[PDB]
Amino acid sequence: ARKGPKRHLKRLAAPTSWYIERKAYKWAVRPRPGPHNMRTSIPLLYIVRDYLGYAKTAREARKILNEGKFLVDGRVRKDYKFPVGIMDVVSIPETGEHYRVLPNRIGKLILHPISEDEAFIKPLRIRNKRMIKGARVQLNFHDGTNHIVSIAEKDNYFTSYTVLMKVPEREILEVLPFEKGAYVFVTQGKNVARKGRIVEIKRFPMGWPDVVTIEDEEGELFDTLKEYAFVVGTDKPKISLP
Amino acid sequence: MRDIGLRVQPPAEKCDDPKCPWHGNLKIHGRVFEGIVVSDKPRKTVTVERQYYFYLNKYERYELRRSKIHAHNPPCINAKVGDKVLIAETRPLSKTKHFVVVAVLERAEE
Amino acid sequence: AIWQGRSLKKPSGGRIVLARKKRKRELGREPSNTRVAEQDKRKIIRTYGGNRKVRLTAAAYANVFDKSGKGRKVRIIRVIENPANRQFARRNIITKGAIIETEIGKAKVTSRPGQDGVVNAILL
Amino acid sequence: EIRIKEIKENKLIGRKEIYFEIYHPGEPTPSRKDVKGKLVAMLDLNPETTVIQYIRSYFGSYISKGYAKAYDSKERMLYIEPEYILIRDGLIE
Amino acid sequence: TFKLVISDPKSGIAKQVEITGAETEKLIGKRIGDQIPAKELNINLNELFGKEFPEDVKLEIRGGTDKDGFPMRPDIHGPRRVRVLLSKGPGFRPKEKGERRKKTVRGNTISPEIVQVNVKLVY
RNA sequence: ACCGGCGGACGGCUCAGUAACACGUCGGUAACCUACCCUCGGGAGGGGGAUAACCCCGGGAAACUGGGGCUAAUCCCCCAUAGGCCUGGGGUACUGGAAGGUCCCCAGGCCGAAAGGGAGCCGUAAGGCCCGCCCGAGGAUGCGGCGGCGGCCGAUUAGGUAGUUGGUGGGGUAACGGCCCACCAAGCCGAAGAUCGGUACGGGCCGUGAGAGCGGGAGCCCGGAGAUGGACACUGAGACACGGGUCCA
């Protein structure tokens, strides 16, 4: 019987968010633990091999990652198992190429190209707030990163707000709030790859999160959960969103 | 008066137990059901019953089943048999007690 | 072994057959049996996941507390009453909730020597 | 003859990637040396840096697919391109 | 024919000698760490080691191996063979950390069966 | 070849048991753990000690195994402070529907960190670049435990269960709990079939049929269980560990 932690992942069981042929082979890259969840990330190796066609063989891909030619969020990463997850910015300076990771309407991830000037801004959902010794306020984002700030600035932030993060130097730029009428891009669910405006927030007790209702560009109304709602602008999207 | 997060008024009695969700350290998280008290003999204990109809795919009729659940009866409310009560999942408490009464929707006499 | 696991009997009564062997993550450990002595003797124990925990096998001093919240480190003379068992008070065993006699007087233990490794109590 | 369907540029690897088709009506599938020495002409490439990976001979077709590399320096191909294909092209004994 | 190996801390040099006859009876009943003047042991150590040695140079029994090859553990009383579970100590060479193995090792006391004896010089 | 960094708790193989919260679904931890991975705030001092390899000799048929010489680190060890834990008192902010927790002050006690580096460029050098260490708070991977419902046959097996069922107070555990223990009570299950036996890993499915349905779980994937049978430890983040250990048959 099994006796502890896995180190493998068969191709057939891979998450449904990966545009990977499944019956060609049997063994895939098990992502190591990292910023984003299994359900909202892919190894960088597959990004290099499939989504960009730069490497045909994983050994060569790993070699190019060893050269450290790749800038994710303004940081080189050699780990060919890095979970590169949702709303990350991939930058290749050798090619001057910049994409943002975003899901599909179907529920799969694609690299939407973005302008270079946008490549330095990363919006982060405020997952939760906590008090650390010294009465300091630490905010845990959707991607697992953490930011420390003063007690006085605690009310500048609330959970479910979006912080436009300057990833190259880790500088907080703007805080989009969660209030009626914001512009929101969905992350998961049947309403994936939708962008609309908020009319109502459904306060649900008994273990069930807040169901926001989103009004699309064409005026059609639908519903999704709080955590799937990701604000990107007060009235228009501050980033190129398909 | 402390909030349980369930739309129901709090019991008037304030008990000193550590196991009253209104008057103790324990929490609530999981489903909420409703049912009837069938037995109360063991101390601070209750067996809640629940009837429901189940569908037979081959016979297209309905089977009425009776399901029992053990739960803890805090003294503040003091549930008795014949009473319609509300039940919530709770921390494991005994060998079998894994649910707790939160209120008495309607006692026996009514 | 010390196995803190399934009861062999169902709630109704039908005896339960085992289908697998015991698991080291599921076994427990011996009782500390903290006693009154002239010095503090303690054992540190490596635990599940590499944690640690210290265990008083003999206790000499106690941290009594006034209702105000001021603490006094003192000695422990003898245990008055052990509600957990009648054999324990007879054998100077020290357990949470026990009524103890120190130089100050009567105290009630509000800490577990088995897991904490120190004994705290409230003056009565 | 040889007709190029595609030439792309791996800038992270400093290499040209060439997809092409070979017309060989009624005549056996060509040897590697000839296709290399004849493709070397019309893109102005150094023979050593250029490597051809696969020439797929289709069943019941006079067109065979072909796919090849073109590096920019001696060191990069040794560092990256594994020894076997160098042996197939003869670039290593 | 006890094979006694005498080792010098001062020089880091060790030499083998043989013992038979009454001198053997002298070393029976002794224990590891026991001290004995070389005079009762009757070796011209000054000749073997080719150096001057004080007449009060003594020999201390330290170890050896049985006939079959079971050393005497200083921590085990008696001259017999007993099986012991060794996590460490003489006669046990572990490889993997925390590994434990059961072996049969002689107890400290010297016996006639023992064929190898080890002694260290002392001045 | 050595201590030492890692791994050999994954993956490979099989279906005896097991009629079970083993399992399918949904919840479920505020009652867990967590090495390598990510983020953020802080820290990385002083001092001491060890023995392999190698050289001198040794046994036994072996397996295996002795003593003396000296030797290394991020090895071991003591202290420095943080820090970990527990309690009393007093307050205030965060999380959250919820509870209480977390935040701070005071008071009492035990426990209680680190590691530098091979090379190269500049710098006399230090230092910087690169890799590596530790404390604290999160995340993430994997796992622990609680639950409603679903899913066999027998009545020529009808009464069953004593830590049995609950309460008080503790113990041990990573963790809640009869898991255990001392006491206090008389429960709890069964004709909408317990108890007992026969039978049997559960699912995604597959064969057949116009379909209702009937029958089956071998081949892949997911979950569960095992290493001839039993039973018990050490190392460890993870084990009772196919290619590690101990006894019995």
PDB file of N, CA and C in Angstrom, chain A residues 49-117:
ATOM      1  N   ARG A  49       7.474  24.110 -23.938  1.00  0.00           N
ATOM      2  CA  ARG A  49       7.439  23.117 -25.005  1.00  0.00           C
ATOM      3  C   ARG A  49       6.223  23.283 -25.900  1.00  0.00           C
ATOM      4  N   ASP A  50       5.038  23.402 -25.309  1.00  0.00           N
ATOM      5  CA  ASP A  50       3.812  23.402 -26.102  1.00  0.00           C
ATOM      6  C   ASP A  50       3.424  24.837 -26.442  1.00  0.00           C
ATOM      7  N   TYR A  51       3.118  25.637 -25.422  1.00  0.00           N
ATOM      8  CA  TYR A  51       2.453  26.910 -25.656  1.00  0.00           C
ATOM      9  C   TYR A  51       3.327  27.898 -26.409  1.00  0.00           C
ATOM     10  N   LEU A  52       4.636  27.652 -26.482  1.00  0.00           N
ATOM     11  CA  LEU A  52       5.551  28.499 -27.224  1.00  0.00           C
ATOM     12  C   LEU A  52       6.396  27.741 -28.236  1.00  0.00           C
ATOM     13  N   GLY A  53       6.394  26.411 -28.207  1.00  0.00           N
ATOM     14  CA  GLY A  53       7.112  25.656 -29.212  1.00  0.00           C
ATOM     15  C   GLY A  53       8.593  25.925 -29.245  1.00  0.00           C
ATOM     16  N   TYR A  54       9.152  26.505 -28.179  1.00  0.00           N
ATOM     17  CA  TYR A  54      10.577  26.813 -28.181  1.00  0.00           C
ATOM     18  C   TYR A  54      11.425  25.566 -27.992  1.00  0.00           C
ATOM     19  N   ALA A  55      10.901  24.557 -27.299  1.00  0.00           N
ATOM     20  CA  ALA A  55      11.636  23.333 -27.025  1.00  0.00           C
ATOM     21  C   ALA A  55      10.800  22.133 -27.431  1.00  0.00           C
ATOM     22  N   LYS A  56      11.400  21.241 -28.212  1.00  0.00           N
ATOM     23  CA  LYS A  56      10.753  19.990 -28.582  1.00  0.00           C
ATOM     24  C   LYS A  56      10.962  18.902 -27.539  1.00  0.00           C
ATOM     25  N   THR A  57      12.128  18.874 -26.899  1.00  0.00           N
ATOM     26  CA  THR A  57      12.481  17.857 -25.920  1.00  0.00           C
ATOM     27  C   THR A  57      12.696  18.506 -24.559  1.00  0.00           C
ATOM     28  N   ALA A  58      12.158  17.864 -23.518  1.00  0.00           N
ATOM     29  CA  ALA A  58      12.175  18.450 -22.181  1.00  0.00           C
ATOM     30  C   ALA A  58      13.586  18.714 -21.685  1.00  0.00           C
ATOM     31  N   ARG A  59      14.550  17.881 -22.074  1.00  0.00           N
ATOM     32  CA  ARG A  59      15.933  18.137 -21.693  1.00  0.00           C
ATOM     33  C   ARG A  59      16.404  19.483 -22.221  1.00  0.00           C
ATOM     34  N   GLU A  60      16.137  19.763 -23.496  1.00  0.00           N
ATOM     35  CA  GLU A  60      16.539  21.045 -24.061  1.00  0.00           C
ATOM     36  C   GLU A  60      15.810  22.187 -23.370  1.00  0.00           C
ATOM     37  N   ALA A  61      14.520  22.003 -23.087  1.00  0.00           N
ATOM     38  CA  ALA A  61      13.779  23.025 -22.360  1.00  0.00           C
ATOM     39  C   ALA A  61      14.445  23.323 -21.027  1.00  0.00           C
ATOM     40  N   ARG A  62      14.750  22.276 -20.264  1.00  0.00           N
ATOM     41  CA  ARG A  62      15.424  22.449 -18.986  1.00  0.00           C
ATOM     42  C   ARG A  62      16.746  23.178 -19.162  1.00  0.00           C
ATOM     43  N   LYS A  63      17.470  22.890 -20.247  1.00  0.00           N
ATOM     44  CA  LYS A  63      18.709  23.618 -20.511  1.00  0.00           C
ATOM     45  C   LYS A  63      18.440  25.108 -20.659  1.00  0.00           C
ATOM     46  N   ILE A  64      17.391  25.456 -21.399  1.00  0.00           N
ATOM     47  CA  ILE A  64      17.112  26.872 -21.611  1.00  0.00           C
ATOM     48  C   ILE A  64      16.676  27.517 -20.300  1.00  0.00           C
ATOM     49  N   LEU A  65      15.929  26.795 -19.462  1.00  0.00           N
ATOM     50  CA  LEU A  65      15.613  27.339 -18.142  1.00  0.00           C
ATOM     51  C   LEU A  65      16.860  27.471 -17.278  1.00  0.00           C
ATOM     52  N   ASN A  66      17.828  26.578 -17.460  1.00  0.00           N
ATOM     53  CA  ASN A  66      19.087  26.700 -16.742  1.00  0.00           C
ATOM     54  C   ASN A  66      19.830  27.953 -17.161  1.00  0.00           C
ATOM     55  N   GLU A  67      19.737  28.320 -18.437  1.00  0.00           N
ATOM     56  CA  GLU A  67      20.311  29.584 -18.872  1.00  0.00           C
ATOM     57  C   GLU A  67      19.638  30.774 -18.199  1.00  0.00           C
ATOM     58  N   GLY A  68      18.459  30.586 -17.617  1.00  0.00           N
ATOM     59  CA  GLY A  68      17.796  31.656 -16.896  1.00  0.00           C
ATOM     60  C   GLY A  68      17.362  32.797 -17.787  1.00  0.00           C
ATOM     61  N   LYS A  69      16.863  32.486 -18.981  1.00  0.00           N
ATOM     62  CA  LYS A  69      16.475  33.484 -19.967  1.00  0.00           C
ATOM     63  C   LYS A  69      15.038  33.950 -19.809  1.00  0.00           C
ATOM     64  N   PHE A  70      14.351  33.515 -18.761  1.00  0.00           N
ATOM     65  CA  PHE A  70      12.916  33.702 -18.627  1.00  0.00           C
ATOM     66  C   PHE A  70      12.640  34.534 -17.392  1.00  0.00           C
ATOM     67  N   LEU A  71      11.773  35.528 -17.540  1.00  0.00           N
ATOM     68  CA  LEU A  71      11.375  36.399 -16.441  1.00  0.00           C
ATOM     69  C   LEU A  71       9.884  36.233 -16.212  1.00  0.00           C
ATOM     70  N   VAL A  72       9.559  35.522 -15.151  1.00  0.00           N
ATOM     71  CA  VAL A  72       8.218  35.481 -14.596  1.00  0.00           C
ATOM     72  C   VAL A  72       8.188  36.485 -13.459  1.00  0.00           C
ATOM     73  N   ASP A  73       7.166  37.341 -13.451  1.00  0.00           N
ATOM     74  CA  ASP A  73       6.995  38.413 -12.470  1.00  0.00           C
ATOM     75  C   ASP A  73       8.306  39.117 -12.136  1.00  0.00           C
ATOM     76  N   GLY A  74       9.138  39.359 -13.146  1.00  0.00           N
ATOM     77  CA  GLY A  74      10.428  39.980 -12.909  1.00  0.00           C
ATOM     78  C   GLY A  74      11.340  39.165 -12.023  1.00  0.00           C
ATOM     79  N   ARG A  75      11.337  37.843 -12.182  1.00  0.00           N
ATOM     80  CA  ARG A  75      12.218  36.953 -11.440  1.00  0.00           C
ATOM     81  C   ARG A  75      12.546  35.760 -12.317  1.00  0.00           C
ATOM     82  N   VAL A  76      13.833  35.485 -12.502  1.00  0.00           N
ATOM     83  CA  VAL A  76      14.225  34.291 -13.235  1.00  0.00           C
ATOM     84  C   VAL A  76      13.939  33.073 -12.373  1.00  0.00           C
ATOM     85  N   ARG A  77      13.498  31.989 -13.009  1.00  0.00           N
ATOM     86  CA  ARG A  77      13.185  30.742 -12.321  1.00  0.00           C
ATOM     87  C   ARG A  77      13.743  29.589 -13.142  1.00  0.00           C
ATOM     88  N   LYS A  78      14.601  28.783 -12.519  1.00  0.00           N
ATOM     89  CA  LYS A  78      15.171  27.610 -13.168  1.00  0.00           C
ATOM     90  C   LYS A  78      14.344  26.351 -12.955  1.00  0.00           C
ATOM     91  N   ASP A  79      13.408  26.364 -12.008  1.00  0.00           N
ATOM     92  CA  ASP A  79      12.636  25.169 -11.688  1.00  0.00           C
ATOM     93  C   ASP A  79      11.714  24.825 -12.844  1.00  0.00           C
ATOM     94  N   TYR A  80      12.009  23.726 -13.530  1.00  0.00           N
ATOM     95  CA  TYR A  80      11.136  23.257 -14.596  1.00  0.00           C
ATOM     96  C   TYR A  80       9.864  22.599 -14.076  1.00  0.00           C
ATOM     97  N   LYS A  81       9.597  22.658 -12.769  1.00  0.00           N
ATOM     98  CA  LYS A  81       8.323  22.254 -12.190  1.00  0.00           C
ATOM     99  C   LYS A  81       7.573  23.419 -11.554  1.00  0.00           C
ATOM    100  N   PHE A  82       7.905  24.652 -11.908  1.00  0.00           N
ATOM    101  CA  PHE A  82       7.322  25.796 -11.214  1.00  0.00           C
ATOM    102  C   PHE A  82       5.847  25.849 -11.590  1.00  0.00           C
ATOM    103  N   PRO A  83       4.934  25.900 -10.634  1.00  0.00           N
ATOM    104  CA  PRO A  83       3.557  26.233 -11.005  1.00  0.00           C
ATOM    105  C   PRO A  83       3.441  27.689 -11.427  1.00  0.00           C
ATOM    106  N   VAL A  84       3.314  27.935 -12.729  1.00  0.00           N
ATOM    107  CA  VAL A  84       3.058  29.271 -13.260  1.00  0.00           C
ATOM    108  C   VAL A  84       1.545  29.388 -13.408  1.00  0.00           C
ATOM    109  N   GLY A  85       0.917  30.100 -12.484  1.00  0.00           N
ATOM    110  CA  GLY A  85      -0.526  30.090 -12.343  1.00  0.00           C
ATOM    111  C   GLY A  85      -1.222  31.293 -12.932  1.00  0.00           C
ATOM    112  N   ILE A  86      -2.335  31.670 -12.310  1.00  0.00           N
ATOM    113  CA  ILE A  86      -3.299  32.560 -12.947  1.00  0.00           C
ATOM    114  C   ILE A  86      -2.899  34.017 -12.758  1.00  0.00           C
ATOM    115  N   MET A  87      -3.010  34.776 -13.849  1.00  0.00           N
ATOM    116  CA  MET A  87      -2.727  36.211 -13.892  1.00  0.00           C
ATOM    117  C   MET A  87      -1.255  36.521 -13.626  1.00  0.00           C
ATOM    118  N   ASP A  88      -0.378  35.541 -13.829  1.00  0.00           N
ATOM    119  CA  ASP A  88       1.051  35.793 -13.840  1.00  0.00           C
ATOM    120  C   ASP A  88       1.455  36.422 -15.165  1.00  0.00           C
ATOM    121  N   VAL A  89       2.606  37.080 -15.153  1.00  0.00           N
ATOM    122  CA  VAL A  89       3.168  37.716 -16.335  1.00  0.00           C
ATOM    123  C   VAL A  89       4.436  36.970 -16.692  1.00  0.00           C
ATOM    124  N   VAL A  90       4.472  36.396 -17.886  1.00  0.00           N
ATOM    125  CA  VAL A  90       5.672  35.750 -18.398  1.00  0.00           C
ATOM    126  C   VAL A  90       6.335  36.713 -19.362  1.00  0.00           C
ATOM    127  N   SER A  91       7.622  36.963 -19.143  1.00  0.00           N
ATOM    128  CA  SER A  91       8.397  37.902 -19.938  1.00  0.00           C
ATOM    129  C   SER A  91       9.674  37.225 -20.401  1.00  0.00           C
ATOM    130  N   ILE A  92       9.915  37.266 -21.705  1.00  0.00           N
ATOM    131  CA  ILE A  92      11.165  36.839 -22.314  1.00  0.00           C
ATOM    132  C   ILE A  92      11.872  38.100 -22.809  1.00  0.00           C
ATOM    133  N   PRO A  93      12.914  38.584 -22.121  1.00  0.00           N
ATOM    134  CA  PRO A  93      13.599  39.788 -22.612  1.00  0.00           C
ATOM    135  C   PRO A  93      14.400  39.546 -23.871  1.00  0.00           C
ATOM    136  N   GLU A  94      14.937  38.339 -24.056  1.00  0.00           N
ATOM    137  CA  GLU A  94      15.703  38.055 -25.264  1.00  0.00           C
ATOM    138  C   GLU A  94      14.855  38.262 -26.509  1.00  0.00           C
ATOM    139  N   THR A  95      13.558  38.000 -26.401  1.00  0.00           N
ATOM    140  CA  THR A  95      12.610  38.209 -27.481  1.00  0.00           C
ATOM    141  C   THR A  95      11.702  39.407 -27.252  1.00  0.00           C
ATOM    142  N   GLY A  96      11.788  40.052 -26.093  1.00  0.00           N
ATOM    143  CA  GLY A  96      10.913  41.175 -25.810  1.00  0.00           C
ATOM    144  C   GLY A  96       9.453  40.795 -25.868  1.00  0.00           C
ATOM    145  N   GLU A  97       9.122  39.593 -25.407  1.00  0.00           N
ATOM    146  CA  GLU A  97       7.777  39.045 -25.521  1.00  0.00           C
ATOM    147  C   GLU A  97       7.150  38.947 -24.140  1.00  0.00           C
ATOM    148  N   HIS A  98       5.878  39.323 -24.037  1.00  0.00           N
ATOM    149  CA  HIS A  98       5.185  39.381 -22.755  1.00  0.00           C
ATOM    150  C   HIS A  98       3.773  38.844 -22.910  1.00  0.00           C
ATOM    151  N   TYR A  99       3.435  37.840 -22.105  1.00  0.00           N
ATOM    152  CA  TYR A  99       2.089  37.298 -22.063  1.00  0.00           C
ATOM    153  C   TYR A  99       1.587  37.297 -20.630  1.00  0.00           C
ATOM    154  N   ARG A 100       0.268  37.230 -20.500  1.00  0.00           N
ATOM    155  CA  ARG A 100      -0.400  37.020 -19.228  1.00  0.00           C
ATOM    156  C   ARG A 100      -1.179  35.715 -19.277  1.00  0.00           C
ATOM    157  N   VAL A 101      -1.130  34.972 -18.176  1.00  0.00           N
ATOM    158  CA  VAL A 101      -1.810  33.686 -18.078  1.00  0.00           C
ATOM    159  C   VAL A 101      -3.272  33.944 -17.751  1.00  0.00           C
ATOM    160  N   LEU A 102      -4.180  33.398 -18.565  1.00  0.00           N
ATOM    161  CA  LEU A 102      -5.602  33.590 -18.314  1.00  0.00           C
ATOM    162  C   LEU A 102      -6.395  32.375 -18.778  1.00  0.00           C
ATOM    163  N   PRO A 103      -7.476  32.019 -18.091  1.00  0.00           N
ATOM    164  CA  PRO A 103      -8.230  30.829 -18.490  1.00  0.00           C
ATOM    165  C   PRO A 103      -8.972  31.070 -19.795  1.00  0.00           C
ATOM    166  N   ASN A 104      -9.626  30.015 -20.268  1.00  0.00           N
ATOM    167  CA  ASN A 104     -10.455  30.074 -21.459  1.00  0.00           C
ATOM    168  C   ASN A 104     -11.927  30.185 -21.075  1.00  0.00           C
ATOM    169  N   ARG A 105     -12.784  30.353 -22.081  1.00  0.00           N
ATOM    170  CA  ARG A 105     -14.203  30.101 -21.877  1.00  0.00           C
ATOM    171  C   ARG A 105     -14.474  28.649 -21.533  1.00  0.00           C
ATOM    172  N   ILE A 106     -13.638  27.734 -22.015  1.00  0.00           N
ATOM    173  CA  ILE A 106     -13.851  26.316 -21.762  1.00  0.00           C
ATOM    174  C   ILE A 106     -13.311  25.903 -20.402  1.00  0.00           C
ATOM    175  N   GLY A 107     -12.370  26.658 -19.843  1.00  0.00           N
ATOM    176  CA  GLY A 107     -11.723  26.282 -18.605  1.00  0.00           C
ATOM    177  C   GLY A 107     -10.337  25.723 -18.838  1.00  0.00           C
ATOM    178  N   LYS A 108      -9.579  26.374 -19.713  1.00  0.00           N
ATOM    179  CA  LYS A 108      -8.184  26.045 -19.939  1.00  0.00           C
ATOM    180  C   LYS A 108      -7.385  27.335 -20.049  1.00  0.00           C
ATOM    181  N   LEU A 109      -6.085  27.232 -19.795  1.00  0.00           N
ATOM    182  CA  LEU A 109      -5.232  28.406 -19.699  1.00  0.00           C
ATOM    183  C   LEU A 109      -4.527  28.697 -21.018  1.00  0.00           C
ATOM    184  N   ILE A 110      -4.452  29.990 -21.351  1.00  0.00           N
ATOM    185  CA  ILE A 110      -3.778  30.473 -22.546  1.00  0.00           C
ATOM    186  C   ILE A 110      -2.931  31.677 -22.154  1.00  0.00           C
ATOM    187  N   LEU A 111      -1.910  31.931 -22.965  1.00  0.00           N
ATOM    188  CA  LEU A 111      -1.015  33.072 -22.811  1.00  0.00           C
ATOM    189  C   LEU A 111      -1.504  34.195 -23.722  1.00  0.00           C
ATOM    190  N   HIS A 112      -2.258  35.131 -23.157  1.00  0.00           N
ATOM    191  CA  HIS A 112      -2.703  36.295 -23.913  1.00  0.00           C
ATOM    192  C   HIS A 112      -1.563  37.304 -23.993  1.00  0.00           C
ATOM    193  N   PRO A 113      -1.076  37.664 -25.179  1.00  0.00           N
ATOM    194  CA  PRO A 113       0.007  38.651 -25.231  1.00  0.00           C
ATOM    195  C   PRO A 113      -0.453  40.004 -24.717  1.00  0.00           C
ATOM    196  N   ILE A 114       0.475  40.718 -24.081  1.00  0.00           N
ATOM    197  CA  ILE A 114       0.215  42.017 -23.482  1.00  0.00           C
ATOM    198  C   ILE A 114       1.351  42.955 -23.855  1.00  0.00           C
ATOM    199  N   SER A 115       1.085  44.250 -23.742  1.00  0.00           N
ATOM    200  CA  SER A 115       2.132  45.221 -23.989  1.00  0.00           C
ATOM    201  C   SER A 115       3.203  45.115 -22.912  1.00  0.00           C
ATOM    202  N   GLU A 116       4.407  45.560 -23.264  1.00  0.00           N
ATOM    203  CA  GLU A 116       5.512  45.524 -22.317  1.00  0.00           C
ATOM    204  C   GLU A 116       5.229  46.399 -21.104  1.00  0.00           C
ATOM    205  N   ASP A 117       4.611  47.563 -21.313  1.00  0.00           N
ATOM    206  CA  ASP A 117       4.364  48.475 -20.201  1.00  0.00           C
ATOM    207  C   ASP A 117       3.442  47.857 -19.159  1.00  0.00           C
TER     208      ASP A 117
END
